[PDB]
Amino acid sequence: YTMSLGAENSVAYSNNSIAIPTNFTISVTTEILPVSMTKTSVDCTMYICG
């Protein structure tokens, strides 16, 4: 299929109306970041020739 970016949301804009929140949600989200890799050392002489 042709993908859809998101649901349409026509914001009810006018020159004298505002939307004020009356409540809140405390949301906890995860962010995973790699920091380091495996430290590898190669004996070049032994790898090429044994």
Binding site: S41, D43, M46, G50
Partner: protein, 50 residues
């Protein structure tokens, strides 16, 4: 099949037609002695970085 290693006793039970043993990385880590049909693990010698 030649190489250098420490030959220890092995708990790997070979099938009777198999002679050598390989790990994931296709290196010979198990072998069968031709004189006496026993299985030997080939641990690589203790190479290290000084």
């Amino acid at each position: 099949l030649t190489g250098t290693g420490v030959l220890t006793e092995s708990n790997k039970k070979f099938l009777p037609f198999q002679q050598f043993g390989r790990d994931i990385a296709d290196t010979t880590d198990a072998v069968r002695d031709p004189q006496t049909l026993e299985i030997l693990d080939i641990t690589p010698c203790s190479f290290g970085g000084v």
